[PDB]
Every structure is written in C-alpha cells, then in structure tokens.
Amino acid sequence: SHRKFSAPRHGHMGFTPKKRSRTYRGRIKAFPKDDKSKPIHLTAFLGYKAGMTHIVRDVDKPGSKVNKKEVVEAVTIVETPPMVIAGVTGYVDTPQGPRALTTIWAEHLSEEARRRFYSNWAKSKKKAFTKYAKKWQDEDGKKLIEADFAKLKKYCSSIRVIAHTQMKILRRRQKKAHLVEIQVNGGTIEQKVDWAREHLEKQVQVDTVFAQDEMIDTIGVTRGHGFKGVTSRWHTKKLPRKTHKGLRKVACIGAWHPSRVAFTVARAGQKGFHHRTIINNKIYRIGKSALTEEGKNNGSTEFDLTQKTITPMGGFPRYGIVNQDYIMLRGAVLGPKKRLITLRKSLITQTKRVAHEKINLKWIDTSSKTGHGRFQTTAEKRAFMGKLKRDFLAE
Amino acid sequence: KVHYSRAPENSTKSCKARGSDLRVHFKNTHEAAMALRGMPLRRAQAFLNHVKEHKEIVPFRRFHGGIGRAAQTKQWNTTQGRWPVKSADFLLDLLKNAESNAEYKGLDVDHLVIEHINVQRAAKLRRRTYRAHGRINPYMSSPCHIEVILAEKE
RNA sequence: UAAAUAUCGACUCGAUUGCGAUAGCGAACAAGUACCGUGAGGGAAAGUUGCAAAGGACUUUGAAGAGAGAGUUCAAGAGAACGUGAAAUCGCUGGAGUGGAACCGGAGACAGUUGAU
RNA sequence: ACGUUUCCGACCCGUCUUGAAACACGGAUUGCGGAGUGCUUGUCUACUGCGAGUCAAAGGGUGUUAAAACCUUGCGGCGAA
RNA sequence: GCCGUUGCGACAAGGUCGUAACGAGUAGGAAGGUCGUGGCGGUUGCGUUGAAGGCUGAGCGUAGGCUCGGCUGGAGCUUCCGUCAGUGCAGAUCGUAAUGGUAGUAGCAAAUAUUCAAGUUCGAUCCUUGAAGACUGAAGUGG
RNA sequence: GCCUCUAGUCGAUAGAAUAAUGUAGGUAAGGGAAGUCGGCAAACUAGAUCCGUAACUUCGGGAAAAGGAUUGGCUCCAGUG
RNA sequence: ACUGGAACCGGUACGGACUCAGGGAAUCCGACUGUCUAAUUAAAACAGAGGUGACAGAUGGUCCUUGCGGACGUUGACUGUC
RNA sequence: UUUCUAGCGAAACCACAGCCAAGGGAACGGGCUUGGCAAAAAUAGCGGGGAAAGAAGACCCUGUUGAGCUUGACUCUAGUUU
RNA sequence: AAGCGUUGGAUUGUUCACCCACUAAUAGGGAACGUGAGCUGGGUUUAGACCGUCGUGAGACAGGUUAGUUUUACCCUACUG
RNA sequence: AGUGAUUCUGCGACGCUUGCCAACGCCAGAUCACUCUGGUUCAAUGUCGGGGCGCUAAAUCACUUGCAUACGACUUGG
C-alpha cells in the first residue's frame, strides 16, 4: 500500500557507509587535470584548522543589494607552514590503471619525516633510510639513482612529489611529520622531473601553490561524534511521546517482503569522522608568518591600522598560536580545531562570478574566542580599563 | 578420585598435582589453564600474577560468548580475553603444590616445565533463584577438577 | 438347636511355572516416614566397599579443602557419594578437513587393516 | 568397514490427507518403562482320542516326592427325531 | 550369471536335485524365521585357569541378528526338544531419571553514602575500635 | 513539608567509564494545540491581609466565583491586662 | 502575646525553600453523601430519602426445618414484609 | 541502567539448520530446479524474516458431548387447596 | 520518459468524502488490503451499563451510547556500525 | 646496449659440448615374452647439516596525549 503522503528520503545514500574514515589524513581521490602549457606548479598543500573568526569586507557585486556595502562574514584560519619536498615518484599507465614505477628519495631526510615510518621512534634504533642515504655517495648507487630518474623521465605519464610537513617549528607536542604525494602540473614530463629534482630537500611555501581570491577544495575527516541513534545520525522524525520502548527510532524498518532489512534504511551507528571533500572555498587572504617582518602584523588590513597578528586575544582556543603562514578561507571547514586539512586546487573550470570576485578586507576580528571578547588587543584592553591593583602593587 | 588424563613420558624426572571439586568457574579456569600450556613454571607463575595485576590477559578461545575486547588480547592473536582472578589464585595454589612435590622428589625446581595441564567439569552444586509469578529456577555452580604434570627439561 | 457352608480382618504356619529395586504392596531402607494443605486429606525418593575395617599409620606442601609419597588388600582404577559403571553431554593429546549447513546411497583412489601350501 | 578426497545421485521423519519437504501437527538429547490382554459365550478351521456314542460334574476310594497321579457314575450335558 | 516364488518332474526324503516361466505395492491377509527375549518339564555343555554385564578388531547372514578375538568384570550361564508368555519402540504436547546449545549470556540498577587510620586473621569494601561525612527525623530506620 | 537533638542506621555485590536505546528528573529562542480520536502528558493557579464578586437559585447556595492590591530587613509609634 | 500604622534600607525577587484549586460559558446522565465487578469496566450501574400499590387483626401473614419445631416476634397497622 | 571489569549466575525456545531471485509445488521455500553467489573468529545495536515464542482457537461449524438460565416444550415433584 | 517532487489544515476512528489555503503540482497505485515482540487503541471485537425496536421470557439486533490488561528477543539470519 | 603492459632481447668475451665420411671397422650391450620406470622420468616446495659472500631490526604491553572512543580501535610522546 502506497504511503499516504509523499516525503523525500532522509539523507544522501551516496555518502554511505557512515563509517569511520580508514585514515586520519585526507586522501586526494583526484588531482586537477594537467595542462602541459602552464608553468610547473604544485596542486595541493597541507595545513591545520586553527580556528574561526569573522571579518568585515566591502562587497563588489554589481546588481546585488549589498553592492558597495560592508558585510560581516565568518572565516576559518588554516595554518600552513612551508612543506619540504622529500622524494619524487611517477606513474605509468597500464590496462588496469596507473601504477607507481619508482620513487627517488632525497639524500638527507629530516628526522621528523623519518618518524612517519615508525610507531616507537624513541625506542627504536632509527635505522630508516640509513643504507639508502649512502647510495647517493656511491658509484653504483649513483648509477641506480640516475637510472631511476631516467625511467621517470622516459616512461611516466604523471609525476608526484612526496612532500612532508615540518613539525618542530610549531613548538607543539607532535614531532612525527605528515607525508603526502602531490601531483605536479604544467610542463612536460621531463620538465616536471627536472623541477622535482631541483626542489628535492627544499621548502615550498603556500603562496606558491595558492593565489588570493581563488576557489580551492578541502579534503579531510569530519568531526567525530561516536555511536549515535537514528534521530541524530539520519535526522528522522521523532516518534510520539506515548511510544513504548523508545521514540528516538525508526518505526518501520521494512515491509514484510523482501523479508530482509534493506541497506537504505536508517540505523544507529557511527556519526562523524567521515572522509569528505568540500569544494569551492574561497581564499580571503594568504598571510605571512608572524615571526617575519612581512607578517609582523598579518592581522591588520589597509584600513585597520592597528598592529596585530591573526591570533585572537588569548590564543586560538584548544589550538595555540598561529606563527606561520596561514590561509583565511570563507565559511566553515571540515573537522575540529588542530585537524589536518588537505587543500587541493579546484578540478572545475571556475566560471561563476563569485570565483573571480576580488575580496577586500576592511577589518579582522581578533577578540578573545573564550567568553565574549570586548577588545581587539591587550594594549586596547589595558588602555580602556586603566590600571589595576596588580599594577599598583607592582609599582 | 579423578585419574590423570595423561601420563608423563617418564615418571622419574616429573611431578604431579591434582585438585577435585574446586569451587571455581569451570570455563574461566579452563581458559586460564590452557593459557599455561608449555610455559616454564616460573613463567607460568609470573603470568598468573600479571593476570591478577591486570598486566596480562587470559585469551578466551573456547568459552568466549559475550566476552569483551581489550588491548592486551593482541599478544595472544585473538580479540577476546579476560582476567579471571579466582582461577588465577586456584591455579597458583595448584602450581605451589606441584612445586612442593618436585622438592619432595628432589628435582631442580628451576628447570620445571608444564608438560601437561587439564581442567574437567565436576558435579554441580545446587541452589535456588526465585522468578516472577511464583516460579523457582535452578541456580547452579559449575566447579572443576584441575590436574597438572610438570617435567624436568634438559 | 450342632454338622456340612462363608471368610485370611486378627493370631500361627506351608508353598509357588508370580516381581527381582522405574518391577513387586505406597513402603526390601528411621514408610503411612520426610514433606504439603486450615481442614477433610495427599504422600515420596532412598538396596550393594571388602572374606575380614585390615576404613589408609607415618613423611611432605598448604590455613584448610586437598595433593605428592607410603601402607592395607586377591584386588583399591573396591577409598567411604565406595560391586559393575552404558548412552547423551563434556575436557585433553595426536592426525585430518574446513568459501552461506551438516549428514547420506552408488564407484574408485589414498591412508589403514588383514591373508598368503 | 561411521577417516580424507573426488564423479553421479541425494528435501525430515511419524501422521491425517485427493494431495506433505511444506508457511499442517508431534519431535532439543540419551537411558530405562510403554500399548489387541484375561475370562465367559459362540462359530469356523487345524490336530488328537473314541465313535451311536462321547464326556463325565459334584462326590467317593486311595495316594506322603498327598493341591499331583490312579480308580470309580441305573442317574447328568451334548448327540441319536 | 546368481537369489527366491510358482508349476512340473527325478530320486530310498520335515531332504536334495533338475527344469521352465516369473519377481511393483499402501490398507490388508497368509507363510518361513538353527531372528531375538523371559519362564517351566526334559535334554547338551561351559564356568574364579574367569559367567552375566560393558567397550570394541576378524568374519558370517538378503535381513532380523550371530560367532570369534582384545580390554574391563567378578558368579553365574548355556545347546537342543516340547510348551507357555507381563516377549522386540523413534515418536504417543508418552511416564521417569539424567544431560545439552542458549551461556559465562539475561542479569545481581527502588528506599541519598560513604571515607581515613588501626585491630584480628593465611586472608578484610563488608567483622571490631576511633575520627569524619550523611540519613530516619518523635503519625521514626527509636523504645 | 524542610532542617536538627535523644535513640538508631550507612543494610540494600562492588570498581572504572559516562556510546546508542531506555527509566526518572531539569530546561528551552519565536509561535502557542498548527500535534492528537481526544490538550493524553506537562505547564499554568495557590499561603495570608485588604478590596471586589455575575447568571441562576430549592433563598441555604453559587463563592476561594470572576478579578485587583499588599507581603522582606531594620528603627520606631499606637492599642489591647 | 497579638493587632494597626510610619520612616529608612536592598535586590533579578520578599507565601524568596517548603507546603497548597488554573478560571469561565454551555449540553447529556445521575438529585445529593454513599456502594460495587479483590486480579482489564468506579460508571449514566446499585443504594438512597421521597411516591404509589399489595397482603396481614394473630384461629393471621411471610419464611425455614426430614421431622419435631423454629425466625420476623421483647412484634400488633404511625406495625411487618413485599 | 545498558557499556568494560572482579565475583556470582538462570530461563524461554530447539526435527535439522540458517544469503537471495524466479519456477513449480499443499496455489507465499532455508532445503527442491535454473540462475545470482560463496572465506576465519568476534563486540555493540536492531527489530524485516524465522507464515518467531507463549495456549490441543475463547470466533464459526460438527458431536445423536455438556452446563447456567427461561418458558406456552415433554415427564415429574416439595408445597398447598379440596 | 518514473530522475525528482507531489504540501498546511477544519469535521469524521474513519479508507473515502467535503471544504479552507498555499503551490511547479497538489497523479494513481503495490510491497501478507507493506508496516502492533515498531507505536497508538479512536473503531471493531468478551465480560459492566443505558436507549429504541423485537420477544411471554431468558434474551437478540453490520441499530445508537459509555467504560473496558496491547506480553517476550539475550537465539539464527538480514541490516547498522 | 636496448626493451616498462619486468621480464625479455641484440652484441660481444670466455668456458662445456655439438655435425658428416672410412664405418657398425673395432670394443661394450643380454635381466629368459609385456604388466609403474625414459627401465634411476620430471616439477614444487619443507626441514636438518656443512661451507661462500653478507646484515646487525622492529612491533606489542604498560604509561602519556585528545583532534578519537560503548569495549577494541584512532591520533600523539618518552
């Protein structure tokens, strides 16, 4: 018997199974199509979701009701310290797909890059790449490495550099670095291999990968919520108050026939910590490291002249202080604070106006995100509140 | 009263110990004892004390219906184990008796290895439980016989 | 108003093509007992060491149960819940199989068993 | 041969039912117990003895390996109209 | 080719043999059973140098079942001839006794609440002492 | 009702953790029964003093109808033997 | 011991916890208080006061008991039962 | 509470067992036929199926089976009148 | 051409029906008349009680009315992790 | 040296062999008639001993972390 009144099904069946992500790091399931004519460039980067804030900007959208008006928008800060290129790998097409042909590592790998190969680095003898390093200063090893480079130049249709994050400069607990394969776009295969070889053991900055007012994609694992019932996992209607045996359930989980529960029915299980790829996040600013002179005031704008860094009053809650380069994305980003976000260039050929709109920041909020912040800087707070008993006793 | 399921390869350099109608759970004790198969005596005693301290887990290989999971189960290549303390105590008492028997027979106690170990169900003890609507159901205890044979390994 | 006649309820006896401990009386035994119901009343289960207790002295670990030695005995693997000790069910050792049943009939092979004046 | 492995065949028994592997009922497993009997009266059939007869009853006489066996009937049963 | 049934036949035999044709079967009817069980009147034997009972290799029979070997067990058992029967179990939501998977599972969640030091003990959340913190709250968790 | 004194108890198997579903409590922006067979459940009201109180009526009631104001602490004033 | 009153004070608030009806306009049924299907129906059902009728003046009426005998009845129409 | 741990520890149910589509079948298969398929051991949930479990259908019919009650059924009877 | 939608409500237990309103549209159906170890229990559908008609009566009435216990998953599979 | 759909090819260099004629010339060869030998058939691996070069790691438990979590698991550090 047909259901009396129609209603769309609850949830998107193309995002199932709602299971925990296989990996903590976001996997890049597709890279932007390679165009041989453009200059050689990287297609992805790694950052950490520091926190959120809000900004004021002037909108240039002809025909809009907010044209030449100021609007307040929420933004997310992603700290993106420079990465280190530690290896080169290439892929050869086969009847069953692309296949990795060879990998050449840099002569000197950082301790934090090598940690990634370990679960007990401190307890171990740290023998990783010890014999490989000697091959770079050997007659036969040099020949083998050169042959690998020749193979990459001659047979591969796609080139990727293994890059790794740097963790010591962040002054935090973790030291193990994150490795990731990033495809190189632009130029021929030979040029890509030469470029990767030159950049082996070298640092790449985020401003060389992403531009301003550019739409990018964020790949990563969402915020986890553990085991959850149907009412929260799938957002089904709650049952009446008079329901015996519970109302936060799905009343009917199938008809008599087929005499089985279908995979399309809502069931309780893991909610959150799902792999996701959100596209079309606009870059509002690429700020420089606050430890350098250029980034000394990466929290100010052309119209807000106060000297301040991006980090809000009292630090980013549950994250720390953003002292490296950062990207200010518009809106929400998947995952909690401290989560590792993989930034990828857009696979789409952007044509909407929002993609090419120029962002003009007028002001960036740096008030405390714990409590209801009333001041933008400690100097402003002290100037407003005057002098306290602590200062009196300090005198 | 209960004969040994096995006999030592050679009774000269070996000792035995037995216990009958012990009021421990047969299933827990059986798993704990089967965990001791082949261990040297000192290793077995250390393992049982670690089990009592929650430093090592007894893997439940046969009677594992509803048993929980734990991190220590990895060392036994299984996903289900527990820490049966009463079973550990009873097995420690049995191993102490076997050690005393070895000393009595004059054997190097520092070279004893568990050649054989077995746990068998014993006659059940009966009690009562009261259910709804004025009914009565059994409330039984499943005790076990335990037997161990230690041998001198060269 | 005796005898011939009825009758094992009571007392005392002799038998048997009957049953052999789920049988035969409900009861082979502290059985009309334990136990149940306010009451009238209802009403079980329960035989077996060994020829003889000779019923395991003594040593040893343990708080003890108990165990390891030892002793008694035709024999204790007859050790007190003790003659024998089945099936179901269950544990160990070794061998072999193991993709949403397992079993089974027919026909070989292997392993194995067995016979060859 | 109640081991393994191959090729072919192979639906769970009992039951009521026109029709059961049935989405019909009983059956979780094992041991032990468990159901056409006794007697009276008929009838037919088979066998045995005697035969216009046959069987004899209650009873009596005797019997001490005495509840048996053995002997015993103007009369009674059935048969001879 | 072999087994049996039926018909016929040979042979000094409740037996053997020959020969030709034949062989489905529920309900049901007959026949055979040196198939099996327990008594009785007789007959034949075995047994503490190991009976009944029990576990299980070599065989026999179309089958019912039977014989022997090995191990356990400790006192009875048995052939054949008549005759007799409380004479054969898979079922009956069968009677009775025992035992499984479920399963180390459901569960041991009302009535506010325990903690520290010590004693005794082989052994203490639970017994005892002291200190603290709470409760019943006089229509009490009192007498 | 709530707290305490005398007297008596800490007896309700314990420990860790605080997923889903639950049982029992506590809240919720704006709307306010649109939910549902149905305002089921919950929420609202309430003590005391002063004031005020309808239809109808068996003249007794209705009635705490409806509906308003006040309420703490401290320092005083007055009355009541 | 209780009652009335006046200044001042604070604070989100004064029956500061606690205890304790939401209110109103109508229709149907039963007048009311009360009783009942212990363990699915608490009601509009039963009872009820009030009304009517019947029988009975005792040698009587209504009942019980096998019978003997007994109850209303320590009663007598303003009574008794139905 | 559930959850994990220590100690303790049941019951219902059970022919054998448990992946499906169609077919035909006692006319809605876990088993059969043809196809789809098919890889240990497990923890927490779940209520689609097992025409799931509880109970020899309280509905309906049959039975030469009843019982409670009624009366103008048949046959009687206490009592009472004569 | 079933990819995707096909609503909020008043009355009624109602499926239907009818009306109010919005809307791109207010399409029709199946899955044991899908879905009760998912709920609810309004109706139907025991026992209490009332009315009308019927019956001498006990009682009857797809005629109306009011109140009337909604049990179990810890097993296998499926599904979710 | 070439080959990319990882092995396979060409070129060398060095070893071990490999053809015909005199010529069945000469020596050996036979298991009695066939029954699993090609009259020692070939491959795949496991393990135990000797040698030749050759190397001198990690997981896990327990602590710790909180981006994770019913328990496992996940993310960190010594």
Swiss-Prot record, chain A:
The keyword Ribosomal protein applies. One of its GO terms (molecular function) is structural constituent of ribosome. One of its GO terms (biological process) is translation. Pfam families: Ribosomal_L3. Keywords: Cytoplasm, Ribonucleoprotein, Ribosomal protein. It comes from the Eukaryota. Residues 1-21 are annotated as: Disordered. GO terms for cellular component: cytosolic large ribosomal subunit. Its main location: cytoplasm. Belongs to the universal ribosomal protein uL3 family. This is Large ribosomal subunit protein uL3.
From Swiss-Prot, chain B:
GO terms for biological process: cytoplasmic translation. Keywords: Ribonucleoprotein, Ribosomal protein. GO terms for cellular component: cytosolic large ribosomal subunit. GO terms for molecular function: structural constituent of ribosome. The keyword Ribosomal protein applies. Belongs to the universal ribosomal protein uL22 family. This is Large ribosomal subunit protein uL22. It comes from Caenorhabditis elegans. The gene is rpl-17.
